Amino acid sequence: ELTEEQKQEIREAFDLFDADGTGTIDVKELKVAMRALGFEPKKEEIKKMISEIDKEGTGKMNFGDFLTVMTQKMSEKDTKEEILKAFKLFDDDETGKISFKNLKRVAKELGENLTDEELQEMIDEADRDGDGEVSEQEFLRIMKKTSLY
């Protein structure tokens, strides 16, 4: 699962930044390159990625390396969306946080039989900022670090 019109889009995107056809683009056009592709990367993520990508500080990247990073980023974006889609199914009162109330309702609808003590344990374990409920970032973080997706 990669595809063809999508492999060919990535190529187009790559060539925008390689008008002279030297076969590389400057690692610095990454963010603009990702945006042309529909992504919305953030500073930290770009800092992090330019650093994974240009491990030998050439300042340059080829098409295979670009293709990788973009396939990888498309898979992550799909995962995020799916995690976000589940976020919304726990937060059915749409308060934008997942509560103890939401979580208990979800366990029941799915036929679990946890105690409030276990239910609370699952909040605390997810609640990093200590506001007593679970944000999207917390929920993303919590999926990021479990069994498989």
Binding site: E82, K85, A86, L89, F90, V106, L110, M143, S147, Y149
Partner: peptide, 17 residues
């Protein structure tokens, strides 16, 4: 855990509609 419950809700929803 979080993931079973999330996965549960996702299946429950990809099935209904």
């Amino acid at each position: 855990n979080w993931k079973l419950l999330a996965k549960g809700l996702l299946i429950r929803e990809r099935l209904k509609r």
